[PDB]
Amino acid sequence: KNVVIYADGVYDMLHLGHMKQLEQAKKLFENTTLIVGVTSDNETKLFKGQVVQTLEERTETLKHIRWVDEIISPCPWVVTPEFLEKYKIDYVAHDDIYAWLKRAGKFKATQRTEGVSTTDLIVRILKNYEDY
Amino acid sequence: KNVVIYADGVYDMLHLGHMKQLEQAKKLFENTTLIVGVTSDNETKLFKGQVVQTLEERTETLKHIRWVDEIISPCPWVVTPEFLEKYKIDYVAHDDIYAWLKRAGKFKATQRTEGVSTTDLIVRILKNYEDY
């Protein structure tokens, strides 16, 4: 019973939070193919915000994560029914616009983990310095 | 022909450079088991330097890398012949004390990649600010 799962994102400065999310997507069912979609620099910058790494770098890193079976790079910014058919996608994984995916039985929620991000790490490096 | 490969390191703030190294270790031969050794906080701090993440965090991240088959956490700081026998290790992978491993045919060099480290990334974030 092989289920195709799709999860998209920026995946900037990949950290344990992304990886835990991807692991969840990948294990939603016993036998899955996890496709990860990586947003383009330009669309990311225009709609969301600043991105630190380019497309190439953000995709190169995802290639090394064990849960990831396939990468669409760059991926469309907005997910569409014709995209789901094109790639034979059974479910979309995202944390919680998705009304139509829920209505179709094709939405599966995953959870973020707080406090594990790469920006959090520098904060830690920096708290080694008394303000005086 | 399954070859057991051992690579050890701190793996602090894991980045594309570590992952490329681990991929190299893993692909040294057609069929391998890659064991990764993760140094303890205390020994790392005493001999090498400051570590940002704890043992648990540094190991949790390595679990998500696809090349990694087994983790020894914490691992011994110095590699010894009796360690190689205990874990049935055919080769040690490290970048380039290793005299005895070379003399025994059990050393396999891997290469680091410069400029891809997580500290490099913050430098990039920061160069978004003119000094004036």
PDB file of all heavy atoms in Angstrom, chain B residues 33-63:
ATOM      1  N   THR B  33      28.340  -0.536   6.439  1.00  0.00           N
ATOM      2  CA  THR B  33      27.642  -0.067   7.623  1.00  0.00           C
ATOM      3  C   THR B  33      28.483   1.066   8.186  1.00  0.00           C
ATOM      4  O   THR B  33      29.657   0.858   8.522  1.00  0.00           O
ATOM      5  CB  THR B  33      27.448  -1.203   8.631  1.00  0.00           C
ATOM      6  OG1 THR B  33      26.521  -2.148   8.092  1.00  0.00           O
ATOM      7  CG2 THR B  33      26.890  -0.716   9.949  1.00  0.00           C
ATOM      8  N   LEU B  34      27.917   2.270   8.217  1.00  0.00           N
ATOM      9  CA  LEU B  34      28.604   3.446   8.736  1.00  0.00           C
ATOM     10  C   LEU B  34      28.195   3.646  10.196  1.00  0.00           C
ATOM     11  O   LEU B  34      27.006   3.838  10.494  1.00  0.00           O
ATOM     12  CB  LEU B  34      28.277   4.680   7.896  1.00  0.00           C
ATOM     13  CG  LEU B  34      28.840   6.008   8.425  1.00  0.00           C
ATOM     14  CD1 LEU B  34      30.348   5.959   8.517  1.00  0.00           C
ATOM     15  CD2 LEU B  34      28.398   7.206   7.570  1.00  0.00           C
ATOM     16  N   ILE B  35      29.172   3.539  11.103  1.00  0.00           N
ATOM     17  CA  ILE B  35      29.021   3.857  12.521  1.00  0.00           C
ATOM     18  C   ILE B  35      29.620   5.230  12.763  1.00  0.00           C
ATOM     19  O   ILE B  35      30.774   5.481  12.404  1.00  0.00           O
ATOM     20  CB  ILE B  35      29.711   2.810  13.412  1.00  0.00           C
ATOM     21  CG1 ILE B  35      29.154   1.430  13.122  1.00  0.00           C
ATOM     22  CG2 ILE B  35      29.552   3.147  14.876  1.00  0.00           C
ATOM     23  CD1 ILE B  35      30.130   0.296  13.418  1.00  0.00           C
ATOM     24  N   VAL B  36      28.846   6.123  13.369  1.00  0.00           N
ATOM     25  CA  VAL B  36      29.304   7.465  13.710  1.00  0.00           C
ATOM     26  C   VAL B  36      29.512   7.523  15.217  1.00  0.00           C
ATOM     27  O   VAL B  36      28.685   7.013  15.986  1.00  0.00           O
ATOM     28  CB  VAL B  36      28.312   8.535  13.236  1.00  0.00           C
ATOM     29  CG1 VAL B  36      28.724   9.929  13.752  1.00  0.00           C
ATOM     30  CG2 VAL B  36      28.263   8.520  11.736  1.00  0.00           C
ATOM     31  N   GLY B  37      30.649   8.068  15.626  1.00  0.00           N
ATOM     32  CA  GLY B  37      30.950   8.283  17.028  1.00  0.00           C
ATOM     33  C   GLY B  37      30.880   9.774  17.340  1.00  0.00           C
ATOM     34  O   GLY B  37      31.434  10.598  16.603  1.00  0.00           O
ATOM     35  N   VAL B  38      30.194  10.081  18.439  1.00  0.00           N
ATOM     36  CA  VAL B  38      29.872  11.438  18.870  1.00  0.00           C
ATOM     37  C   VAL B  38      30.584  11.687  20.189  1.00  0.00           C
ATOM     38  O   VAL B  38      30.313  10.996  21.178  1.00  0.00           O
ATOM     39  CB  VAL B  38      28.358  11.613  19.039  1.00  0.00           C
ATOM     40  CG1 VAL B  38      28.043  13.041  19.302  1.00  0.00           C
ATOM     41  CG2 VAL B  38      27.636  11.111  17.800  1.00  0.00           C
ATOM     42  N   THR B  39      31.490  12.665  20.215  1.00  0.00           N
ATOM     43  CA  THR B  39      32.329  12.855  21.396  1.00  0.00           C
ATOM     44  C   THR B  39      31.534  13.453  22.552  1.00  0.00           C
ATOM     45  O   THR B  39      30.589  14.225  22.350  1.00  0.00           O
ATOM     46  CB  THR B  39      33.514  13.755  21.066  1.00  0.00           C
ATOM     47  OG1 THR B  39      33.027  14.924  20.407  1.00  0.00           O
ATOM     48  CG2 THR B  39      34.482  13.037  20.148  1.00  0.00           C
ATOM     49  N   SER B  40      31.934  13.103  23.781  1.00  0.00           N
ATOM     50  CA  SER B  40      31.236  13.607  24.959  1.00  0.00           C
ATOM     51  C   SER B  40      31.454  15.106  25.106  1.00  0.00           C
ATOM     52  O   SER B  40      32.452  15.659  24.633  1.00  0.00           O
ATOM     53  CB  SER B  40      31.711  12.920  26.240  1.00  0.00           C
ATOM     54  OG  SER B  40      33.126  12.962  26.380  1.00  0.00           O
ATOM     55  N   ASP B  41      30.518  15.768  25.794  1.00  0.00           N
ATOM     56  CA  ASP B  41      30.686  17.195  26.065  1.00  0.00           C
ATOM     57  C   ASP B  41      31.972  17.448  26.835  1.00  0.00           C
ATOM     58  O   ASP B  41      32.780  18.307  26.463  1.00  0.00           O
ATOM     59  CB  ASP B  41      29.488  17.748  26.846  1.00  0.00           C
ATOM     60  CG  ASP B  41      28.162  17.455  26.164  1.00  0.00           C
ATOM     61  OD1 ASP B  41      27.854  18.110  25.148  1.00  0.00           O
ATOM     62  OD2 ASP B  41      27.417  16.580  26.648  1.00  0.00           O
ATOM     63  N   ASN B  42      32.186  16.693  27.912  1.00  0.00           N
ATOM     64  CA  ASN B  42      33.270  17.029  28.819  1.00  0.00           C
ATOM     65  C   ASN B  42      34.623  16.863  28.142  1.00  0.00           C
ATOM     66  O   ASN B  42      35.487  17.745  28.231  1.00  0.00           O
ATOM     67  CB  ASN B  42      33.171  16.181  30.082  1.00  0.00           C
ATOM     68  CG  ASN B  42      32.054  16.652  30.989  1.00  0.00           C
ATOM     69  OD1 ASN B  42      31.495  17.732  30.779  1.00  0.00           O
ATOM     70  ND2 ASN B  42      31.750  15.874  32.023  1.00  0.00           N
ATOM     71  N   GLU B  43      34.833  15.735  27.466  1.00  0.00           N
ATOM     72  CA  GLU B  43      36.105  15.532  26.787  1.00  0.00           C
ATOM     73  C   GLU B  43      36.283  16.531  25.651  1.00  0.00           C
ATOM     74  O   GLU B  43      37.373  17.093  25.476  1.00  0.00           O
ATOM     75  CB  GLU B  43      36.204  14.098  26.271  1.00  0.00           C
ATOM     76  CG  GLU B  43      36.339  13.070  27.398  1.00  0.00           C
ATOM     77  CD  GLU B  43      36.190  11.659  26.883  1.00  0.00           C
ATOM     78  OE1 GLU B  43      35.089  11.301  26.405  1.00  0.00           O
ATOM     79  OE2 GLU B  43      37.178  10.903  26.960  1.00  0.00           O
ATOM     80  N   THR B  44      35.226  16.770  24.873  1.00  0.00           N
ATOM     81  CA  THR B  44      35.299  17.791  23.835  1.00  0.00           C
ATOM     82  C   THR B  44      35.743  19.126  24.413  1.00  0.00           C
ATOM     83  O   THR B  44      36.647  19.776  23.880  1.00  0.00           O
ATOM     84  CB  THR B  44      33.953  17.958  23.141  1.00  0.00           C
ATOM     85  OG1 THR B  44      33.562  16.719  22.539  1.00  0.00           O
ATOM     86  CG2 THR B  44      34.072  19.035  22.066  1.00  0.00           C
ATOM     87  N   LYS B  45      35.111  19.554  25.506  1.00  0.00           N
ATOM     88  CA  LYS B  45      35.433  20.857  26.073  1.00  0.00           C
ATOM     89  C   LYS B  45      36.876  20.905  26.561  1.00  0.00           C
ATOM     90  O   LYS B  45      37.569  21.914  26.384  1.00  0.00           O
ATOM     91  CB  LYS B  45      34.451  21.179  27.198  1.00  0.00           C
ATOM     92  CG  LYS B  45      33.093  21.672  26.652  1.00  0.00           C
ATOM     93  CD  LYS B  45      31.856  20.897  27.176  1.00  0.00           C
ATOM     94  CE  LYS B  45      31.152  21.668  28.307  1.00  0.00           C
ATOM     95  NZ  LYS B  45      30.327  20.801  29.208  1.00  0.00           N
ATOM     96  N   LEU B  46      37.362  19.810  27.141  1.00  0.00           N
ATOM     97  CA  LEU B  46      38.682  19.838  27.758  1.00  0.00           C
ATOM     98  C   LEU B  46      39.793  19.841  26.712  1.00  0.00           C
ATOM     99  O   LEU B  46      40.748  20.620  26.805  1.00  0.00           O
ATOM    100  CB  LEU B  46      38.819  18.655  28.711  1.00  0.00           C
ATOM    101  CG  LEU B  46      40.221  18.279  29.173  1.00  0.00           C
ATOM    102  CD1 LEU B  46      40.661  19.219  30.291  1.00  0.00           C
ATOM    103  CD2 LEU B  46      40.234  16.831  29.657  1.00  0.00           C
ATOM    104  N   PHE B  47      39.680  18.990  25.698  1.00  0.00           N
ATOM    105  CA  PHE B  47      40.746  18.845  24.712  1.00  0.00           C
ATOM    106  C   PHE B  47      40.587  19.770  23.513  1.00  0.00           C
ATOM    107  O   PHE B  47      41.581  20.321  23.031  1.00  0.00           O
ATOM    108  CB  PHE B  47      40.815  17.391  24.233  1.00  0.00           C
ATOM    109  CG  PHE B  47      40.968  16.407  25.349  1.00  0.00           C
ATOM    110  CD1 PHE B  47      40.054  15.395  25.531  1.00  0.00           C
ATOM    111  CD2 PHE B  47      42.031  16.506  26.225  1.00  0.00           C
ATOM    112  CE1 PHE B  47      40.202  14.483  26.571  1.00  0.00           C
ATOM    113  CE2 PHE B  47      42.185  15.604  27.273  1.00  0.00           C
ATOM    114  CZ  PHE B  47      41.267  14.598  27.448  1.00  0.00           C
ATOM    115  N   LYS B  48      39.370  19.889  22.987  1.00  0.00           N
ATOM    116  CA  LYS B  48      39.189  20.660  21.728  1.00  0.00           C
ATOM    117  C   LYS B  48      38.774  22.094  22.033  1.00  0.00           C
ATOM    118  O   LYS B  48      39.612  22.994  21.867  1.00  0.00           O
ATOM    119  CB  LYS B  48      38.154  19.985  20.827  1.00  0.00           C
ATOM    120  CG  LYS B  48      38.352  20.191  19.333  1.00  0.00           C
ATOM    121  CD  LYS B  48      37.657  19.137  18.507  1.00  0.00           C
ATOM    122  CE  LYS B  48      37.641  19.458  17.030  1.00  0.00           C
ATOM    123  NZ  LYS B  48      37.854  18.244  16.207  1.00  0.00           N
ATOM    124  N   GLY B  49      37.520  22.292  22.419  1.00  0.00           N
ATOM    125  CA  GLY B  49      37.051  23.633  22.676  1.00  0.00           C
ATOM    126  C   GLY B  49      35.582  23.634  23.043  1.00  0.00           C
ATOM    127  O   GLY B  49      34.997  22.605  23.406  1.00  0.00           O
ATOM    128  N   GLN B  50      35.001  24.824  22.949  1.00  0.00           N
ATOM    129  CA  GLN B  50      33.608  25.006  23.309  1.00  0.00           C
ATOM    130  C   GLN B  50      32.703  24.270  22.328  1.00  0.00           C
ATOM    131  O   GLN B  50      32.968  24.218  21.119  1.00  0.00           O
ATOM    132  CB  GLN B  50      33.280  26.498  23.352  1.00  0.00           C
ATOM    133  CG  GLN B  50      34.391  27.328  24.002  1.00  0.00           C
ATOM    134  CD  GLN B  50      34.092  28.815  24.014  1.00  0.00           C
ATOM    135  OE1 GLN B  50      33.035  29.241  24.476  1.00  0.00           O
ATOM    136  NE2 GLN B  50      35.034  29.615  23.529  1.00  0.00           N
ATOM    137  N   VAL B  51      31.652  23.659  22.871  1.00  0.00           N
ATOM    138  CA  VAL B  51      30.636  22.969  22.088  1.00  0.00           C
ATOM    139  C   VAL B  51      29.305  23.656  22.359  1.00  0.00           C
ATOM    140  O   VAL B  51      29.009  24.028  23.500  1.00  0.00           O
ATOM    141  CB  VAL B  51      30.591  21.460  22.424  1.00  0.00           C
ATOM    142  CG1 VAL B  51      29.847  21.213  23.732  1.00  0.00           C
ATOM    143  CG2 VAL B  51      29.953  20.683  21.300  1.00  0.00           C
ATOM    144  N   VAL B  52      28.529  23.878  21.307  1.00  0.00           N
ATOM    145  CA  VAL B  52      27.282  24.624  21.448  1.00  0.00           C
ATOM    146  C   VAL B  52      26.137  23.726  21.878  1.00  0.00           C
ATOM    147  O   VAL B  52      25.301  24.127  22.689  1.00  0.00           O
ATOM    148  CB  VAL B  52      26.948  25.338  20.130  1.00  0.00           C
ATOM    149  CG1 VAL B  52      25.630  26.071  20.265  1.00  0.00           C
ATOM    150  CG2 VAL B  52      28.083  26.266  19.733  1.00  0.00           C
ATOM    151  N   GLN B  53      26.058  22.525  21.328  1.00  0.00           N
ATOM    152  CA  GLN B  53      24.970  21.612  21.631  1.00  0.00           C
ATOM    153  C   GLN B  53      25.453  20.484  22.524  1.00  0.00           C
ATOM    154  O   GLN B  53      26.621  20.100  22.479  1.00  0.00           O
ATOM    155  CB  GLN B  53      24.390  21.032  20.348  1.00  0.00           C
ATOM    156  CG  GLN B  53      24.009  22.074  19.344  1.00  0.00           C
ATOM    157  CD  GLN B  53      23.488  21.473  18.075  1.00  0.00           C
ATOM    158  OE1 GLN B  53      24.241  21.211  17.151  1.00  0.00           O
ATOM    159  NE2 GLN B  53      22.192  21.244  18.022  1.00  0.00           N
ATOM    160  N   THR B  54      24.541  19.950  23.332  1.00  0.00           N
ATOM    161  CA  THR B  54      24.884  18.851  24.215  1.00  0.00           C
ATOM    162  C   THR B  54      25.022  17.552  23.430  1.00  0.00           C
ATOM    163  O   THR B  54      24.811  17.489  22.214  1.00  0.00           O
ATOM    164  CB  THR B  54      23.826  18.671  25.295  1.00  0.00           C
ATOM    165  OG1 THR B  54      22.585  18.352  24.664  1.00  0.00           O
ATOM    166  CG2 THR B  54      23.661  19.951  26.085  1.00  0.00           C
ATOM    167  N   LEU B  55      25.418  16.499  24.144  1.00  0.00           N
ATOM    168  CA  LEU B  55      25.485  15.189  23.524  1.00  0.00           C
ATOM    169  C   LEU B  55      24.135  14.830  22.929  1.00  0.00           C
ATOM    170  O   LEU B  55      24.020  14.598  21.729  1.00  0.00           O
ATOM    171  CB  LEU B  55      25.944  14.139  24.539  1.00  0.00           C
ATOM    172  CG  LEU B  55      26.287  12.771  23.927  1.00  0.00           C
ATOM    173  CD1 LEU B  55      27.375  12.901  22.857  1.00  0.00           C
ATOM    174  CD2 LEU B  55      26.722  11.787  24.998  1.00  0.00           C
ATOM    175  N   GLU B  56      23.088  14.851  23.746  1.00  0.00           N
ATOM    176  CA  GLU B  56      21.765  14.440  23.285  1.00  0.00           C
ATOM    177  C   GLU B  56      21.365  15.167  22.005  1.00  0.00           C
ATOM    178  O   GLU B  56      20.959  14.542  21.024  1.00  0.00           O
ATOM    179  CB  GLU B  56      20.744  14.686  24.394  1.00  0.00           C
ATOM    180  CG  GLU B  56      21.089  14.007  25.735  1.00  0.00           C
ATOM    181  CD  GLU B  56      22.345  14.567  26.407  1.00  0.00           C
ATOM    182  OE1 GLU B  56      22.565  15.793  26.391  1.00  0.00           O
ATOM    183  OE2 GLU B  56      23.111  13.779  26.991  1.00  0.00           O
ATOM    184  N   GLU B  57      21.471  16.495  21.992  1.00  0.00           N
ATOM    185  CA  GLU B  57      21.111  17.240  20.791  1.00  0.00           C
ATOM    186  C   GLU B  57      21.998  16.877  19.610  1.00  0.00           C
ATOM    187  O   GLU B  57      21.523  16.791  18.474  1.00  0.00           O
ATOM    188  CB  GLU B  57      21.213  18.741  21.042  1.00  0.00           C
ATOM    189  CG  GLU B  57      20.564  19.250  22.298  1.00  0.00           C
ATOM    190  CD  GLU B  57      20.907  20.729  22.529  1.00  0.00           C
ATOM    191  OE1 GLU B  57      22.107  21.073  22.412  1.00  0.00           O
ATOM    192  OE2 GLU B  57      20.005  21.534  22.864  1.00  0.00           O
ATOM    193  N   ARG B  58      23.304  16.720  19.835  1.00  0.00           N
ATOM    194  CA  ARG B  58      24.166  16.437  18.689  1.00  0.00           C
ATOM    195  C   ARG B  58      23.898  15.048  18.153  1.00  0.00           C
ATOM    196  O   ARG B  58      24.089  14.799  16.967  1.00  0.00           O
ATOM    197  CB  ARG B  58      25.649  16.591  19.045  1.00  0.00           C
ATOM    198  CG  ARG B  58      26.022  17.996  19.467  1.00  0.00           C
ATOM    199  CD  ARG B  58      27.497  18.147  19.744  1.00  0.00           C
ATOM    200  NE  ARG B  58      27.858  17.691  21.078  1.00  0.00           N
ATOM    201  CZ  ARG B  58      28.790  16.780  21.304  1.00  0.00           C
ATOM    202  NH1 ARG B  58      29.408  16.170  20.306  1.00  0.00           N
ATOM    203  NH2 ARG B  58      29.101  16.466  22.556  1.00  0.00           N
ATOM    204  N   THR B  59      23.446  14.133  19.003  1.00  0.00           N
ATOM    205  CA  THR B  59      23.144  12.804  18.508  1.00  0.00           C
ATOM    206  C   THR B  59      21.769  12.774  17.858  1.00  0.00           C
ATOM    207  O   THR B  59      21.591  12.156  16.799  1.00  0.00           O
ATOM    208  CB  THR B  59      23.235  11.814  19.655  1.00  0.00           C
ATOM    209  OG1 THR B  59      24.508  11.974  20.312  1.00  0.00           O
ATOM    210  CG2 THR B  59      23.076  10.381  19.141  1.00  0.00           C
ATOM    211  N   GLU B  60      20.794  13.465  18.454  1.00  0.00           N
ATOM    212  CA  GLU B  60      19.459  13.505  17.870  1.00  0.00           C
ATOM    213  C   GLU B  60      19.516  13.965  16.416  1.00  0.00           C
ATOM    214  O   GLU B  60      18.836  13.402  15.551  1.00  0.00           O
ATOM    215  CB  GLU B  60      18.538  14.412  18.711  1.00  0.00           C
ATOM    216  CG  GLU B  60      17.043  14.022  18.694  1.00  0.00           C
ATOM    217  CD  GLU B  60      16.174  14.909  19.600  1.00  0.00           C
ATOM    218  OE1 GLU B  60      16.648  15.374  20.661  1.00  0.00           O
ATOM    219  OE2 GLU B  60      15.012  15.168  19.234  1.00  0.00           O
ATOM    220  N   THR B  61      20.359  14.953  16.111  1.00  0.00           N
ATOM    221  CA  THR B  61      20.439  15.455  14.740  1.00  0.00           C
ATOM    222  C   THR B  61      21.040  14.412  13.794  1.00  0.00           C
ATOM    223  O   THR B  61      20.537  14.192  12.680  1.00  0.00           O
ATOM    224  CB  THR B  61      21.261  16.743  14.748  1.00  0.00           C
ATOM    225  OG1 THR B  61      20.810  17.583  15.814  1.00  0.00           O
ATOM    226  CG2 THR B  61      21.138  17.502  13.447  1.00  0.00           C
ATOM    227  N   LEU B  62      22.113  13.752  14.223  1.00  0.00           N
ATOM    228  CA  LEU B  62      22.763  12.752  13.390  1.00  0.00           C
ATOM    229  C   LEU B  62      21.820  11.619  13.047  1.00  0.00           C
ATOM    230  O   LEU B  62      21.921  11.021  11.975  1.00  0.00           O
ATOM    231  CB  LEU B  62      23.986  12.226  14.132  1.00  0.00           C
ATOM    232  CG  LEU B  62      25.244  13.031  13.877  1.00  0.00           C
ATOM    233  CD1 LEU B  62      26.319  12.564  14.861  1.00  0.00           C
ATOM    234  CD2 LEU B  62      25.682  12.725  12.457  1.00  0.00           C
ATOM    235  N   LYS B  63      20.891  11.305  13.933  1.00  0.00           N
ATOM    236  CA  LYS B  63      19.940  10.248  13.633  1.00  0.00           C
ATOM    237  C   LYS B  63      19.174  10.528  12.339  1.00  0.00           C
ATOM    238  O   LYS B  63      18.708   9.588  11.679  1.00  0.00           O
ATOM    239  CB  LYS B  63      18.989  10.082  14.814  1.00  0.00           C
ATOM    240  CG  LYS B  63      17.668   9.405  14.495  1.00  0.00           C
ATOM    241  CD  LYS B  63      16.810   9.298  15.753  1.00  0.00           C
ATOM    242  CE  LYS B  63      16.375  10.654  16.256  1.00  0.00           C
ATOM    243  NZ  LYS B  63      14.923  10.669  16.597  1.00  0.00           N
TER     244      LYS B  63
END
